[PDB]
Amino acid sequence: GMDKSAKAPAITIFDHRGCSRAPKESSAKSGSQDDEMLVKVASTKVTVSEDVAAKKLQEFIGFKEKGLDGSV
Amino acid sequence: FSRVVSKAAYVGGADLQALKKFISEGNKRLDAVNSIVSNASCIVSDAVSGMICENPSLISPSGNCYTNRRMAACLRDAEIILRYVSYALLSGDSSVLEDRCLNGLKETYSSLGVPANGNARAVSIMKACSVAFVNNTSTPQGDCSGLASEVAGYFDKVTSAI
Amino acid sequence: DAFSRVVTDSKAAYVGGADLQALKKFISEGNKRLDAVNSIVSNASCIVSDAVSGMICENPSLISPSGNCYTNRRMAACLRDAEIILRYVSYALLSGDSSVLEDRCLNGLKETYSSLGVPANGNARAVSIMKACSVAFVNNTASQKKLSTPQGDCSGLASEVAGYFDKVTSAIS
Amino acid sequence: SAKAPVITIFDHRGCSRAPKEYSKASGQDDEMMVKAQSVKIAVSDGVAESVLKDSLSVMH
Ligand SMILES: *C(=C)C1=C(C)C(=O)N/C1=C\c1[nH]c(/C=C2\N=C(C[C@H]3NC(=O)C(C=C)=C3C)C(C)=C2CCC(=O)O)c(CCC(=O)O)c1C
Ligand SMILES: *C(=C)C1=C(C)C(=O)N/C1=C\c1[nH]c(/C=C2\N=C(C[C@H]3NC(=O)C(C=C)=C3C)C(C)=C2CCC(=O)O)c(CCC(=O)O)c1C
Ligand SMILES: *C(=C)C1=C(C)[C@@H](Cc2[nH]c(/C=C3N=C(/C=C4\NC(=O)[C@H](C)[C@H]4[C@@H](*)C)C(C)=C\3CCC(=O)O)c(CCC(=O)O)c2C)NC1=O
Ligand SMILES: *C(=C)C1=C(C)[C@@H](Cc2[nH]c(/C=C3N=C(/C=C4\NC(=O)[C@H](C)[C@H]4[C@@H](*)C)C(C)=C\3CCC(=O)O)c(CCC(=O)O)c2C)NC1=O
Ligand SMILES: *[C@@H](C)[C@H]1/C(=C/C2=NC(=C\c3[nH]c(C[C@H]4NC(=O)C(C=C)=C4C)c(C)c3CCC(=O)O)/C(CCC(=O)O)=C2C)NC(=O)[C@@H]1C
Ligand SMILES: *[C@@H](C)[C@H]1/C(=C/C2=NC(=C\c3[nH]c(C[C@H]4NC(=O)C(C=C)=C4C)c(C)c3CCC(=O)O)/C(CCC(=O)O)=C2C)NC(=O)[C@@H]1C
Ligand SMILES: *[C@H](C)[C@H]1/C(=C/C2=NC(=C\c3[nH]c(C[C@H]4NC(=O)C(C=C)=C4C)c(C)c3CCC(=O)O)/C(CCC(=O)O)=C2C)NC(=O)[C@@H]1C
Ligand SMILES: *[C@H](C)[C@H]1/C(=C/C2=NC(=C\c3[nH]c(C[C@H]4NC(=O)C(C=C)=C4C)c(C)c3CCC(=O)O)/C(CCC(=O)O)=C2C)NC(=O)[C@@H]1C
């Protein structure tokens, strides 16, 4: 059940082939380009700072404008 | 990927090779997840803004997004939902999404007074966003419509649930 | 002058009604100019975030241990500076001139960044991206059902805001 | 002091929320406003971490 915790899965995809920063977080070599790519997954509490919410209210309250995408 | 759902799981190298052998279209699946999650902030804020401009009273003194506490909580919820959907796309099924996210959520909103119609619109916007990023409407060009319909279905499960 | 005291305490300033009508009579293309400002300021968060992100994806070493955006403190300061710059550009566009932009934001900024070791080329890319975003939003060529404004021609305003961004890049590099 | 102008554009033609914060114009200019304020610009650590997480996942 939903446990009112706020926690959600935070996924990071690193397609970092050719990256000069060396892999060191995963521990199972395959000798292919898969060794330079990684999926990271954590369970983190999602929080939105009331400062952010205030700035978002400032962007939203015009009630007219938008991004490029989207119907009106 | 189940010990997470508090050490992070790191899946690369041979573990990633096997992961991609154990799921449908592993490479495309990870590109689709990458394109949603890397745009999650814009998706969350665009969906909440659209819900609000369509119904401005949500930030009037009588609306459920009025005050920073409520606006922040709402943005948080939209992000939580988007992240659980993204995990459902990563894992190729909706079990964690339905059980740990949706099971019991609608009654909670009913207790709090979170309006069903606004949530419906917000979710619909996040769906349109994710489908547009998966179908790209950085990667090799091709056809990702299957994964797009899959994530569409996970959003549709959210919509049905709440 | 009602806006002078603003962009120099805490209490705001509110321009509506007859004052708004006359303000639009005193500045070039008042309705269009207000639309352009609204489209920049309502997307400010995505513009700043996307510009810093593009600066970083072109040169990842900026968030390497030795990069100038490394750690939350430095990253936050970089996003903050980008937002400051975009806001001053938006005020220059609202006013129709660069006086406040040059005097209270660009003055000494190059020497400050030189002393902090803030890299000129990364700053240039970030601002350039913010410029491209702002021009795209002013020249917005979206369908009417997906446009927030009456369809017309705003290439002049886009050129003007591009000039303000050019003043930024010329001053801080 | 890290302050910047914040501009809020209210095209509220047809809006039921009565004006109050602002001479009238005898026209639709009575339902629209431009607001400007000098506001300390600040960015939380969470936005920085989100921009970081998003930047790492699109670079190659
Ligand atoms: C290439 C791109 C990079 C250049 C050039 C550069 O200067 N830095 C580059 C990348 C970079 N990576 C990190 C940190 C992380 N990278 C990963 C992902 C990879 N680790 C792996 O083992 C594999 C494959 C098996 C990867 C792909 C992870 C997990 C981290 C840690 C941070 C996180 O969010 O979990 C940085 C940040 C600074 C540092 O630690 O060097 C940078 C700049
Ligand atoms: C119409 C659209 C609205 C419906 C329907 C609804 O439920 N709420 C609507 C609008 C709304 N307005 C505010 C707050 C402010 N609006 C203004 C702008 C106007 N003030 C004026 O004097 C004029 C005319 C000259 C305007 C146009 C201002 C200044 C505020 C206060 C806050 C701010 O951002 O500075 C809200 C938010 C809550 C409230 O105060 O009602 C909403 C939802
Ligand atoms: C309120 C005035 C208001 C909005 C806010 C806006 C909300 C809205 N947005 C869409 C559709 C999309 N939004 C997307 C978001 C983004 N695209 C980007 O490039 C960045 C990274 C990100 C943040 C802005 C995307 C991708 C889509 C879908 C693509 C497309 O629509 O072509 C909708 C449409 C929802 C639907 O179709 O039901 C809406 C309502 N519109 C507003 O009116
Ligand atoms: C790094 C891998 C990387 C990026 C990040 C991305 C950065 C980038 N963005 C542009 C141009 C624009 N970005 C815009 C932003 C938005 N559109 C929306 O709908 C929302 C509200 C908002 C935030 C996401 C806009 C409008 C533009 C301009 C249109 C265009 O296509 O140019 C660029 C290009 C800048 C330039 O041309 O110099 C870049 C680099 N790209 C990356 O590679
Ligand atoms: C829909 C999602 C997209 C699209 C994606 C495609 N990706 C294709 C191949 C491909 N993608 C990756 C990266 C991926 N694998 C990983 O392990 C990780 C990170 C951990 C990621 C992000 C790879 C490695 C490959 C294989 C080719 C290569 O080596 O570059 C692909 C080709 C088809 C296929 O491989 O089945 C497609 C179509 N393309 C689109 O047009 C939409 C937008
Ligand atoms: C370039 C920025 C745009 C674009 C803008 C146009 N707007 C036009 C007319 C117009 N715009 C407004 C809103 C404006 N006036 C205000 O007082 C305020 C807020 C205080 C705002 C935001 C109004 C009221 C009008 C007049 C008509 C109407 O009532 O809708 C317009 C028409 C031509 C002209 O007025 O000279 C244009 C072209 N158009 C574009 O294509 C880009 C994206
Ligand atoms: C935003 C798009 C919505 C909206 C959301 C609000 N939710 C509020 C509180 C709240 N939300 C949850 C569910 C959340 N917690 C979790 O742990 C998970 C998943 C694991 C989820 C989805 C809970 C449990 C609560 C209450 C407790 C808490 O805040 O931690 C909320 C605040 C209500 C209030 O206190 O007035 C809001 C505003 N509101 C909207 O109007 C749109 C539609
Ligand atoms: C991000 C796009 C940059 C980057 C930026 C950094 N700036 C740092 C510090 C800093 N920035 C300013 C200027 C800012 N304050 C103002 O009042 C105004 C205009 C009115 C502006 C533009 C100041 C004064 C300072 C120093 C004091 C302070 O931190 O408030 C900074 C921190 C440096 C450090 O911690 O040593 C960074 C990282 N860095 C980058 O790599 C890109 C290009």
PDB file of C-alpha atoms in Angstrom, chain A residues 3-52:
ATOM      1  CA  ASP A   3       2.652   4.354   2.908  1.00  0.00           C
ATOM      2  CA  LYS A   4       2.341   8.185   2.978  1.00  0.00           C
ATOM      3  CA  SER A   5       6.207   8.213   3.081  1.00  0.00           C
ATOM      4  CA  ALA A   6       6.777  10.709   0.100  1.00  0.00           C
ATOM      5  CA  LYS A   7       9.560   8.359  -1.165  1.00  0.00           C
ATOM      6  CA  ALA A   8       9.670   7.572  -4.890  1.00  0.00           C
ATOM      7  CA  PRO A   9      12.223   5.839  -7.141  1.00  0.00           C
ATOM      8  CA  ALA A  10      14.900   8.177  -8.503  1.00  0.00           C
ATOM      9  CA  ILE A  11      16.397   6.709 -11.679  1.00  0.00           C
ATOM     10  CA  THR A  12      19.559   8.008 -13.347  1.00  0.00           C
ATOM     11  CA  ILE A  13      20.589   6.686 -16.764  1.00  0.00           C
ATOM     12  CA  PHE A  14      24.250   7.228 -17.688  1.00  0.00           C
ATOM     13  CA  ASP A  15      24.996   6.442 -21.306  1.00  0.00           C
ATOM     14  CA  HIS A  16      28.605   7.580 -20.821  1.00  0.00           C
ATOM     15  CA  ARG A  17      30.375   5.650 -23.560  1.00  0.00           C
ATOM     16  CA  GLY A  18      33.758   7.190 -24.318  1.00  0.00           C
ATOM     17  CA  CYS A  19      33.648   9.210 -21.093  1.00  0.00           C
ATOM     18  CA  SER A  20      37.103   9.911 -19.649  1.00  0.00           C
ATOM     19  CA  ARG A  21      35.752   9.567 -16.088  1.00  0.00           C
ATOM     20  CA  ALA A  22      36.295   5.918 -15.221  1.00  0.00           C
ATOM     21  CA  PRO A  23      33.466   3.623 -14.051  1.00  0.00           C
ATOM     22  CA  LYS A  24      33.772   2.592 -10.422  1.00  0.00           C
ATOM     23  CA  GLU A  25      30.232   2.130  -9.065  1.00  0.00           C
ATOM     24  CA  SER A  26      29.251  -1.174 -10.745  1.00  0.00           C
ATOM     25  CA  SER A  27      31.157  -4.391 -10.047  1.00  0.00           C
ATOM     26  CA  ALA A  28      30.733  -6.909 -12.893  1.00  0.00           C
ATOM     27  CA  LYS A  29      32.858  -6.426 -16.009  1.00  0.00           C
ATOM     28  CA  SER A  30      31.468  -7.569 -19.367  1.00  0.00           C
ATOM     29  CA  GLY A  31      34.301  -6.398 -21.649  1.00  0.00           C
ATOM     30  CA  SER A  32      31.819  -4.534 -23.869  1.00  0.00           C
ATOM     31  CA  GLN A  33      30.544  -0.959 -24.084  1.00  0.00           C
ATOM     32  CA  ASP A  34      28.019  -1.998 -21.426  1.00  0.00           C
ATOM     33  CA  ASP A  35      30.930  -1.363 -19.018  1.00  0.00           C
ATOM     34  CA  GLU A  36      30.616   2.378 -19.764  1.00  0.00           C
ATOM     35  CA  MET A  37      26.868   2.625 -19.134  1.00  0.00           C
ATOM     36  CA  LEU A  38      24.909   2.407 -15.910  1.00  0.00           C
ATOM     37  CA  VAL A  39      21.380   2.475 -14.538  1.00  0.00           C
ATOM     38  CA  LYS A  40      21.184   3.856 -11.006  1.00  0.00           C
ATOM     39  CA  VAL A  41      18.026   3.495  -8.913  1.00  0.00           C
ATOM     40  CA  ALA A  42      17.362   4.850  -5.427  1.00  0.00           C
ATOM     41  CA  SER A  43      14.297   5.313  -3.236  1.00  0.00           C
ATOM     42  CA  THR A  44      14.393   8.955  -2.165  1.00  0.00           C
ATOM     43  CA  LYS A  45      11.919  11.172  -0.356  1.00  0.00           C
ATOM     44  CA  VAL A  46      10.555  13.683  -2.855  1.00  0.00           C
ATOM     45  CA  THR A  47      10.373  17.184  -1.402  1.00  0.00           C
ATOM     46  CA  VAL A  48       9.547  20.533  -3.005  1.00  0.00           C
ATOM     47  CA  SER A  49      10.843  23.552  -1.102  1.00  0.00           C
ATOM     48  CA  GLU A  50       8.254  26.222  -0.330  1.00  0.00           C
ATOM     49  CA  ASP A  51      10.661  28.700  -1.960  1.00  0.00           C
ATOM     50  CA  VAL A  52      10.406  26.701  -5.182  1.00  0.00           C
TER      51      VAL A  52
END
